[PDB]
Amino acid sequence: DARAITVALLSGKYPPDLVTNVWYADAIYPMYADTEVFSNLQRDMITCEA
């Protein structure tokens, strides 16, 4: 939808006091406790094996 994307392009704001290296350090930290990638790797190995 063009309307929605234009609205997004026109009305973006940051948190009042932003420090990127802290915000990302806080946000990204949980998401690299996920071990799904390695499982996908093993699945990929079995696919070619089969």
Binding site: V19, N21, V22, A25
Partner: peptide, 9 residues
């Protein structure tokens, strides 16, 4: 410091 911290705080 929390999350490494910053000199701005």
């Amino acid at each position: 410091p929390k999350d490494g911290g910053s000199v701005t705080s």
